[PDB]
C-alpha cells in the first residue's frame, strides 16, 4: 500500500506551486504605486529571488535526508510553507513581498528534494518508478493551471486578503494528513552512507542529465518576466488576459507529463528526450514572429509540451544511473536535478536584460533556440556502460 505515500507528494507539489502562481494577479497592484517584449526589472527581481534562495538551499538538504530520514524534512517544508502563506496574508510592502518569496522558496526546496527522494526510494522497479514520477510531476502543472484563475476572480469578487487565508486553510488541513501517514516522531538514519556529491558531479552521464533540464527551463524563463501583462497603465485595454496567460503552458505540460511517463519506457528513454529538446527549440524560434499577443499562444503550447517530454523522461534516469553505478541513496542526486531545474530561473531575469541592452530582445530568443538544438544530439550517449 505504497500508493497513498505517492498521493502525499502530489499534494506537496500542487499547493506549493499554487502559491507562486496565486500572486500573479496581485503583482501590479503595488508595483506601480512599442515592442511586444518590453522588459521590466521590478518583476525580474521578484522572479529570481525565490529561486536564488532555493538554489542555495538545495544541496544542504541532500545530505540532511541521509542522516535524519525523509519524513522530518518534508514536515518542516510544510510548516515553513504555512508560515510563508501567513506572511503573505499581511504583506503590504514590496520588500515584505520579497521576504515572503524567500521563505517560500526554502520550503519549496525542502518539499521537492525530500519528496522525490522518498518517491524513488519506495518504487524500486524501474518502469514503476518511471510512471509514478510521471504522475507526481502533474501536480506542478495543476498548480500552474489553478493558481492564476482561482485567485483573480475571488480577489475582486470577495476581498484582497481572501485568496491567501482560504488557501492557508487547505495547507493546515494538509498538515493533518502528514501527521497520520509519515509519523515524524522517531528520527532514524539510512542503512548505508551515500556517495559524496563531488564524485557524482565528476560523472558525465549525470552532467548531461542535468544540462538537458537546465537548457529548456532557461529558455522558458528568459521569456516569462518580459511580457506586456505586468505593464500597468490606463492605456491598457483589459486585464482579462491577466489570469489566463499562463494557460497554454500548464495545460500542455500535464498531458506531456502523464502521457510519456508510461510511454517513454516503451521506446528509448534517450530518444524521448532528444526529440523533446528539438521541438522546444523549434517552438522558441517562432517567438520572434509574434507581432501580437495572441501570436504567443501557439508557441507556448509546444514549449510546455516538450518541457514535459523532457522532465518525465530525465527525472527517473537520474535514480537509475545512481543505482547502476554508485550507492543506492537517492537523496543527493535529485538535489542536483532540482538545482538544474532552478538555475534557469536563477539566472534568466538578469542575463536576459543584459542581452536586451546589448542586442534586440528577439535576437536573444534566436540564440537560446539554436543552442538547444545544438545540445540535442549529445543526448544519444545516455546508454550507460556499467
Ligand atoms: C510569479 O512567479 C512565477 C510565475 C511562474 C513560474 C514561476 C514563477 O516564479 C518562479 C513558472 C513556474 C513553472 O514551473 C512553469 C513551467 C510550465 C512550463 C509547466 C512556468 N512558470 C509559470 C509561472
From Swiss-Prot:
Recorded consequence of changing residue 338 to N: Abolishes dopamine uptake. Abolishes serotonin uptake
Any Pfam family hit: MFS_1
Record annotation: effect of changing residue 228 to A: Abolishes dopamine uptake
The protein's name: Synaptic vesicular amine transporter
Family: Belongs to the major facilitator superfamily. Vesicular transporter family.
Effect of substituting residue 24 to A: Abolishes binding to dihydrotetrabenazine. Reduces dopamine uptake
UniProt: serotonin binding residues: 140, 144, 217, 220, 224, 246, 253, 311, 345
Lumenal, vesicle-side segments: 93-101, 155-160, 224-240, 291-301, 348-352
Lineage: Eukaryota, Metazoa, Chordata, Craniata, Vertebrata
Record annotation: effect of changing residue 16 to N: Abolishes dopamine uptake. Abolishes serotonin uptake
Catalysed conversion reaction: serotonin(in) + 2 H(+)(out) = serotonin(out) + 2 H(+)(in); dopamine(in) + 2 H(+)(out) = dopamine(out) + 2 H(+)(in); histamine(in) + 2 H(+)(out) = histamine(out) + 2 H(+)(in)
Consequence when changing residue 101 to K: Abolishes binding to dihydrotetrabenazine. Abolishes binding to tetrabenazine. Abolishes serotonin uptake
Impact when changing residue 230 to R: Abolishes binding to dihydrotetrabenazine
